[PDB]
């Protein structure tokens, strides 16, 4: 790689909210604070909700009962 055309590329630490501290090589200079990493993400964990959740019948039977 060429010497003086590329930006400075140093190591840094990115502390996550959940505590999954990681060390990666970047160019930001200062340390990083992260909100959602690859461990505390709902999709990665597997807890992803949906939209349908039944429909009209359950609501009707729970609101109006003969």
């Amino acid at each position: 790689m060429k010497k003086d055309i590329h930006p400075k590329y140093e190591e840094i630490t990115a502390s996550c909210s959940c505590g999954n501290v990681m060390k990666i090589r970047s160019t930001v200079g200062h340390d990083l604070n992260l909100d959602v990493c690859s461990k505390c993400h709902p999709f990665f964990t597997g807890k992803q909700r949906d939209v349908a959740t039944g429909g009209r019948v359950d609501r009707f039977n729970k609101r109006f009962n003969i």
């Binding site: 790689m1 060429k2 055309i5 590329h6 930006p7 400075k8 590329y9 990115a14 990681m22 990666i24 090589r25 970047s26 160019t27 930001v28 990083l32 992260l34 909100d35 959602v36 990493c37 690859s38 993400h41 999709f43 990665f44 992803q48």
Partner: protein
């Protein structure tokens, strides 16, 4: 090199077991990662592409190549030689570091992220993807943004089929729906 070590330790075993491979060379490997930014608005201003080059170099520590037009096109009011895009190629330690940083930080940070499609291997095992926003990368400060300009990533691998590419990405723990 963390992802390279993780691959060489606990990916070749899984791929060989699930594909009945005879040699380690049969195991697919990630040849390269190329990032592209097709800024089709550089005609009005050259700085609009010079800032895109800086935004693309802030993500990966390489000065981007200012690609040009292969031929003149009238539907886009361009002529041959006009620079309209930025390209970056990553192979080796920087490629692995960018892959790890992407999958660990940038992919979860995407707004309304609900996984990634598994039908973008173009029938050859090389995986294409595209983002609609760049500030998901933590190397960009919100107060210093000029415009929002996305990019498209392509992972070129030695795999011969979409099944093998998807298996390699799953072993690398890539977001799949």
């Amino acid at each position: 090199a963390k992802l390279h070590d993780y691959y060489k330790d606990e990916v070749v075993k899984k791929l060989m077991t699930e594909f009945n491979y005879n040699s380690v060379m049969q195991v697919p490997r990630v040849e390269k990662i190329t990032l592209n930014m097709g800024v089709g608005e550089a005609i009005a201003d050259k700085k609009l592409l010079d800032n895109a080059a800086a935004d693309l170099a802030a993500i990966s520590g390489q000065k981007p190549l200012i690609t040009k037009a292969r031929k003149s096109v009238a539907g886009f009011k361009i002529r041959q030689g006009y620079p309209i895009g930025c390209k970056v190629t990553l192979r080796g330690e920087r490629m692995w570091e960018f892959f790890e940083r992407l999958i660990t930080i940038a992919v979860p940070r995407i707004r309304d992220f609900r996984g990634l499609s598994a039908k973008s291997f173009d029938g050859r095992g090389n995986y294409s993807m595209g983002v609609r926003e760049q500030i998901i990368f933590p190397e960009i400060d919100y107060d210093k943004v000029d415009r929002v300009r996305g990019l498209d990533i392509t992972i070129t691998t030695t795999a011969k089929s979409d099944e093998e590419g998807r298996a390699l990405l799953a072993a690398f723990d890539f977001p799949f729906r």
